[PDB]
């Protein structure tokens, strides 16, 4: 990664063994549950493109998703080249030049070139750009790997209301999409998909109930 | 987080892998027991708004509670905008709005700018207050019993009953035993134990009461 030292200068530092193990373990244990994406983003703080590719390459399973990630990266990389034709006679006037799509992804760039862009004034944040492409791809994987549609989450006869609500908003989260779809669904389906006992209580609550009011009201509901 | 360097300057530092796992583990193992909130506050030392969102977003389960937290954050954000509406100035940065404090409309660099200003605008600390308010509500929701529902079993050692009493009292207040509780602790005690506590008189400390009821 690139970090600031006590001296105040931005320097490259090797990816830590702790960091490497953390990413592999989160993928092994959580697969592509939505909370994986924020962890990748948190674990990849300051990463060079090399470091980001290292993290992705250390994943042993789930190679269909990782190949999907390559396609998404390549699609986003191509649009970069299209939007930044950055084509001209090479100046070679002691400045580096040409961040390209393949350079941002670490395919055609050296670590020193990558460090050069990230540490320039003004900085060319090739690491941050690449991280966006990787996260866009991971978002797609999470949606694809969502096991249940929100329409099919229905409260069990013995399921505590909290557990049903947990499943409901977890499923809504993997499917992602806007908060506007969320609040619509919330009224259209959370009450409708509740169990008979809770629904009478929820129906009796009236309009404008908060999630807190609904969950407290349904606290009990048998088990 | 924002930390001080050997040069004496406040600089940004990446959130540590140890910190990230520690928060995830505490939520997985302790859920929303009241002691979780002091740990969040300790684990989020120096946090930017971004870091706080990272910690909350890395929690995988308990997404119903997390949605409640989002509702509470939005309520607190609106009141900030209501009390500081103007920005809803070249030498000065912009004034943070509710959505800037929560890290929704602010960049890391803007967050660093406010937190490292002289005087500092502690956007991280303000957001942490809002997050803790939400967690307090969650802790109360998951309290299984009201303190009014805490009654000493007939054979329960007084120490074990007192443990249950103050654990519940802590969670339902999300917290700081007034004369009310004082009265209730004795009234809900077991029959033989009650006589010892009544005979102690007014102003007995908890230490005196627990020793006094030792032997029951």
């Amino acid at each position: 990664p690139i970090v600031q030292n006590l001296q105040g200068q931005m320097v490259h530092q090797c990816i830590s063994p702790r960091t490497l193990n953390a990413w592999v373990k989160v993928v092994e244990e959580k697969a592509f549950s939505p909370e994986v994406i924020p962890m990748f983003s948190a674990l990849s703080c300051g990463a060079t493109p090399q470091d980001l590719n290292t993290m992705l390459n250390t994943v042993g399973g789930h190679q269909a998703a990782m190949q999907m990630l390559k396609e998404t990266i390549n699609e986003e990389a191509a649009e970069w080249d299209r939007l930044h034709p950055v084509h001209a006679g090479p100046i070679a006037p002691g400045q580096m030049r040409e961040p390209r799509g393949s350079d941002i992804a670490g395919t055609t760039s050296t670590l020193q070139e990558q460090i050069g862009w990230m540490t320039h004034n003004p900085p060319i944040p090739v690491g941050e750009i690449y991280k966006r492409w990787i996260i866009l791809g991971l978002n797609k994987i999470v949606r694809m790997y969502s096991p249940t549609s929100i329409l099919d989450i229905r409260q069990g006869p013995k399921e505590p209301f909290r557990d049903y609500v947990d499943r409901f908003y977890k499923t809504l989260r993997a499917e992602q999409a806007s908060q506007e779809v969320k609040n619509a669904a919330t009224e259209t389906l959370l009450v409708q998909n509740a169990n008979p006992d809770c629904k009478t209580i929820l129906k009796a609550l009236g309009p404008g109930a908060t999630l807190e009011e609904m969950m407290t009201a349904c606290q009990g509901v048998g088990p | 987080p924002i930390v001080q360097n050997l040069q004496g300057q406040m600089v940004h530092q990446c959130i540590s892998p140890r910190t990230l796992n520690a928060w995830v583990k505490v939520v997985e193992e302790k859920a929303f027991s009241p002691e979780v909130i002091p740990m969040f506050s300790a684990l989020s030392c120096g946090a930017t708004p971004q870091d706080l969102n990272t910690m909350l977003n890395t929690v995988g389960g308990h997404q119903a509670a997390m949605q409640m937290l989002k509702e509470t954050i939005n309520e607190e954000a609106a009141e900030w905008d209501r009390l500081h509406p103007v920005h809803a100035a070249p030498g000065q940065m912009r004034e943070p709005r509710g959505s800037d404090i929560a890290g929704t409309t602010s960049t890391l660099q803007e967050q660093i700018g406010w937190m490292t200003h002289n005087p500092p605008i502690p956007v991280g600390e303000i957001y942490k207050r809002w997050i803790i308010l939400g967690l307090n509500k969650i802790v109360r929701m998951y309290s299984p019993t009201s303190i009014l529902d805490i009654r000493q079993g007939p054979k329960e050692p007084f120490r074990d009953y007192v443990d249950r009493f103050y654990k519940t009292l802590r969670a339902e207040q999300a917290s700081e035993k007034n004369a009310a509780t004082e009265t209730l602790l004795v009234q809900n005690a077991n029959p033989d134990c009650k006589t010892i506590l009544k005979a102690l008189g007014p102003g007995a400390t908890l230490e005196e009461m627990m020793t006094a009821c030792q032997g029951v």
């Epitope: 009478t200 407290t216 606290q219 509901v221 | 109360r140 009014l148």
Partner: nanobody, 113 residues
Framework: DVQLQESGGGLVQAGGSLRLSCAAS????????MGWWRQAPGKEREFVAR???????VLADSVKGRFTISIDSAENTLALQMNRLKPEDTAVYYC????????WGQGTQVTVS
């Protein structure tokens, strides 16, 4: 299990006040939510008030300025004090309580004329 019954209803003049009371079996602190609904003859069931355990009471807009809901944990009763009554408030009034399911009383009649 749990039975609840309203009381305090009667005939009142336009421009008056009344205090309705909803009696609960057991202790009222055990219910996780209680409230009040009303229905006027021929009209759809209308929502009046709700109180959830650990929560501030929320009131309907047609009554927001006036009526008040109270809880007496000592007497185990949930009271709704009605003030500034209008002739349109004549309706059938029902109380509800939430535990393992929702329980209702049979209601008390309130007539403004």
């Amino acid at each position: 299990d749990v039975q609840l019954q309203e009381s305090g209803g009667g005939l009142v003049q336009a421009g008056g006040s009344l205090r309705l009371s909803c009696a609960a079996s057991g202790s009222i602190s055990r219910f996780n939510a209680m409230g009040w609904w009303r229905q006027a003859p021929g009209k759809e069931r209308e929502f009046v008030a709700r109180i959830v355990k650990g929560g501030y009471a929320v009131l309907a807009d047609s009554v927001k300025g006036r009526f008040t809901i109270s809880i007496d944990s000592a007497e185990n009763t949930l009271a709704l004090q009605m003030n500034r009554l209008k002739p349109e408030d004549t309706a059938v009034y029902y109380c509800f309580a939430a535990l393992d399911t929702a329980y209702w009383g049979q209601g008390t009649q309130v007539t403004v004329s």
